[PDB]
Design a protein around this motif. Structure first.
Motif, PDB file in Angstrom:
ATOM      1  N   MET A 271       3.136   0.965 -12.236  1.00 12.26           N
ATOM      2  CA  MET A 271       1.829   1.443 -12.643  1.00 12.26           C
ATOM      3  C   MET A 271       1.802   2.075 -14.029  1.00 12.26           C
ATOM      4  SD  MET A 271      -0.350   0.375 -10.560  1.00 12.26           S
ATOM      5  CE  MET A 271      -1.509   1.064 -11.754  1.00 12.26           C
ATOM      6  N   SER A 272       2.969   2.379 -14.592  1.00  7.74           N
ATOM      7  CA  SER A 272       3.051   2.914 -15.953  1.00  7.74           C
ATOM      8  C   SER A 272       3.394   1.818 -16.954  1.00  7.74           C
ATOM      9  CB  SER A 272       4.079   4.046 -16.053  1.00  7.74           C
ATOM     10  OG  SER A 272       3.850   5.049 -15.082  1.00  7.74           O
ATOM     11  N   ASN A 273       3.514   0.576 -16.460  1.00  5.55           N
ATOM     12  CA  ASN A 273       3.762  -0.588 -17.306  1.00  5.55           C
ATOM     13  C   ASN A 273       2.500  -1.438 -17.422  1.00  5.55           C
ATOM     14  OD1 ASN A 273       4.412  -3.456 -17.946  1.00  5.55           O
ATOM     15  ND2 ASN A 273       6.534  -2.696 -18.035  1.00  5.55           N
ATOM     16  N   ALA A 274       1.863  -1.382 -18.589  1.00  4.49           N
ATOM     17  CA  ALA A 274       0.584  -2.053 -18.809  1.00  4.49           C
ATOM     18  C   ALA A 274       0.588  -3.562 -18.511  1.00  4.49           C
ATOM     19  CB  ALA A 274       0.103  -1.802 -20.212  1.00  4.49           C
TER      20      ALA A 274
ATOM     21  N   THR B 170      -0.104   9.404  -6.837  1.00  8.74           N
ATOM     22  CA  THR B 170      -0.518   9.237  -8.238  1.00  8.74           C
ATOM     23  C   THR B 170      -0.538   7.763  -8.691  1.00  8.74           C
ATOM     24  OG1 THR B 170       1.653   9.757  -9.155  1.00  8.74           O
ATOM     25  CG2 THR B 170       0.158  11.566  -8.812  1.00  8.74           C
ATOM     26  N   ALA B 171       0.415   6.951  -8.219  1.00  7.16           N
ATOM     27  CA  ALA B 171       0.410   5.501  -8.535  1.00  7.16           C
ATOM     28  C   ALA B 171      -0.813   4.822  -7.944  1.00  7.16           C
ATOM     29  CB  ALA B 171       1.672   4.817  -8.036  1.00  7.16           C
ATOM     30  N   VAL B 172      -1.133   5.165  -6.699  1.00  2.74           N
ATOM     31  CA  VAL B 172      -2.326   4.641  -6.020  1.00  2.74           C
ATOM     32  C   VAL B 172      -3.586   4.980  -6.818  1.00  2.74           C
ATOM     33  CG1 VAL B 172      -3.812   4.876  -3.954  1.00  2.74           C
ATOM     34  CG2 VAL B 172      -1.324   4.473  -3.707  1.00  2.74           C
ATOM     35  N   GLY B 173      -3.689   6.239  -7.249  1.00  4.05           N
ATOM     36  CA  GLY B 173      -4.771   6.679  -8.140  1.00  4.05           C
ATOM     37  C   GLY B 173      -4.858   5.873  -9.422  1.00  4.05           C
TER      38      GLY B 173
ATOM     39  N   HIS C 151     -12.733   0.545  -3.177  1.00  2.00           N
ATOM     40  CA  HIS C 151     -12.318   1.783  -2.506  1.00  2.00           C
ATOM     41  C   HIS C 151     -10.954   1.548  -1.808  1.00  2.00           C
ATOM     42  CE1 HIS C 151     -16.701   3.561  -2.264  1.00  2.00           C
ATOM     43  NE2 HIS C 151     -16.184   3.619  -3.482  1.00  2.00           N
ATOM     44  N   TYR C 152     -10.392   2.569  -1.175  1.00  2.00           N
ATOM     45  CA  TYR C 152      -9.130   2.375  -0.469  1.00  2.00           C
ATOM     46  C   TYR C 152      -9.002   3.289   0.737  1.00  2.00           C
ATOM     47  CZ  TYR C 152      -7.347   6.683  -2.513  1.00  2.00           C
ATOM     48  OH  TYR C 152      -7.184   7.985  -2.885  1.00  2.00           O
ATOM     49  N   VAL C 153      -8.077   2.928   1.626  1.00  2.00           N
ATOM     50  CA  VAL C 153      -7.547   3.771   2.685  1.00  2.00           C
ATOM     51  C   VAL C 153      -6.019   3.669   2.528  1.00  2.00           C
ATOM     52  CG1 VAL C 153      -7.197   3.926   5.192  1.00  2.00           C
ATOM     53  CG2 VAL C 153      -9.450   3.420   4.306  1.00  2.00           C
ATOM     54  N   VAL C 154      -5.307   4.781   2.638  1.00  2.00           N
ATOM     55  CA  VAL C 154      -3.842   4.755   2.491  1.00  2.00           C
ATOM     56  C   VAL C 154      -3.164   5.559   3.603  1.00  2.00           C
ATOM     57  CG1 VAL C 154      -3.585   6.780   0.965  1.00  2.00           C
ATOM     58  CG2 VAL C 154      -1.926   4.816   0.796  1.00  2.00           C
TER      59      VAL C 154
ATOM     60  N   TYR D  48       1.302   2.128   3.790  1.00  2.00           N
ATOM     61  CA  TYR D  48       0.462   0.939   3.837  1.00  2.00           C
ATOM     62  C   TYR D  48      -0.812   1.316   3.101  1.00  2.00           C
ATOM     63  CZ  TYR D  48       3.491  -0.880   7.593  1.00  2.00           C
ATOM     64  OH  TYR D  48       4.551  -1.368   8.325  1.00  2.00           O
ATOM     65  N   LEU D  49      -1.192   0.492   2.127  1.00  2.00           N
ATOM     66  CA  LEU D  49      -2.420   0.709   1.369  1.00  2.00           C
ATOM     67  C   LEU D  49      -3.394  -0.444   1.581  1.00  2.00           C
ATOM     68  CD1 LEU D  49      -4.042   2.067  -1.056  1.00  2.00           C
ATOM     69  CD2 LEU D  49      -2.549   0.725  -2.610  1.00  2.00           C
TER      70      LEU D  49
END
Ligand SMILES: *[C@@H]1O[C@H](CO)[C@@H](O[C@@H]2O[C@H](CO)[C@@H](O)[C@H](O)[C@H]2NC(C)=O)[C@H](O)[C@H]1NC(C)=O
Ligand SMILES: *[C@H]1O[C@H](CO)[C@@H](O)[C@H](O)[C@H]1NC(C)=O
Ligand SMILES: [Ca+2]
Ligand SMILES: [Ca+2]
Ligand SMILES: [Mg+2]
Length: 260
Positions: free
Chosen positions: A16-19, A46-49, A64-67, A80-81
């Motif tokens: 998630m920090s790699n564009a 934070t990665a999910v965000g 939207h999401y549920v995690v 599980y996301l």
């Protein structure tokens, strides 16, 4: 309506920090109205965000999401996301499957399913549940088999026969051998229809394995499945990537399906 299950190898802060990787992960996930993401190693979410921010880059509420909480008998635990398009579907509620006694070293799943119930106005089936599973590869036969009991439990909880069971079951190659299939109630029972076939390749690496699966049960849901729409999505071929780049995204392909 389009639904996918995607194991994204050790998904979390690093990818998630790699564009570049974000760009592709977003492009793959944006194909789907609901997408299960597995191997989420993200203890503070934070990665999910970051993922959602990228998914929602040019319009708020695109996804939207549920995690789930982190699951696993020891390090490293995985969430599980589910990401979903809230204009298309609604995530109604969820619960953790009771796989027996963990402290005892007795329990039936490494990562017991965090089951989510969906409402979907555009399909022939309005109410259905998804049971996610990233099976421990060394216990794949017993874990897949145990999904039979998870199914029965969903009917106890919600009175719901319409259930999609999907994810990285590790259902092939050395983890489930050709003759071990009769040992798997989820497979022997006619209650279930296996949509991703045994011949599928769901690995982004040069192996040819049908690890990732989609299984359905219930009158309305089975009728809503577009026959032969269940397939691995080879993002390497689709986007013309090198082996290196493809495998840096994940060692698995998503498996997707269409509901009418
Ligand atoms: C972001 O990810 C890309 C893809 O994995 C990385 O770029 C690669 O870097 C490796 C190792 O340096 C090279 O062998 C490849 O040629 C690169 N691939 C591509 C597609 O350019 C990159 O290292 C990552 N960025 C950062 C800052 O870690
Ligand atoms: C697991 O362990 C406990 C304590 O030893 C025992 O009472 C129970 O029968 C075991 N459970 C199963 C499902 O085998
Ligand atoms: Ca467990
Ligand atoms: Ca492969
Ligand atoms: Mg893996």
């Amino acid at each position: 309506l389009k639904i996918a299950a995607f194991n994204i190898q050790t998904f979390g802060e690093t990818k998630m920090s790699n564009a570049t990787l974000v760009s592709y992960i977003v492009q793959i996930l944006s194909r789907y109205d609901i997408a299960l993401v597995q191997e989420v190693r993200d203890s503070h979410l934070t990665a999910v965000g970051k993922l959602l921010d990228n998914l929602n880059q040019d319009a708020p509420d695109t996804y939207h999401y549920v995690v789930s909480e982190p699951l696993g008998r020891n390090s490293y635990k995985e969430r599980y996301l589910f990401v979903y398009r809230p204009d298309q579907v609604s995530a109604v509620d969820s619960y953790y499957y009771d796989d027996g006694c963990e402290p005892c070293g007795n329990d039936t799943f490494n990562r017991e399913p965090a089951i989510v119930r969906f409402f979907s106005r555009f399909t022939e089936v309005r109410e259905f549940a998804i049971v996610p599973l990233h099976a421990a590869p060394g216990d794949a036969v017993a874990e897949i088999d145990a999904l039979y009991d998870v199914y029965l439990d969903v009917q106890e909880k919600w009175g719901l026969e319409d259930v999609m069971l999907m994810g990285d079951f590790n259902a092939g190659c050395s983890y489930v051998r050709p003759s071990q299939w009769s040992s798997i109630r989820l497979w022997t029972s006619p209650t279930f229809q296996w949509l991703i076939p045994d011949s599928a390749d769901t690995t982004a690496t040069p192996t040819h394995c049908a690890y990732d699966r989609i299984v359905v049960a219930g009158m309305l849901l089975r009728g809503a499945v577009v026959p032969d729409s269940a397939l691995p999505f080879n993002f390497q071929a689709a986007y013309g990537l090198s082996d290196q780049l493809a495998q840096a995204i994940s060692d698995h392909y998503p498996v997707e399906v269409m509901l009418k």
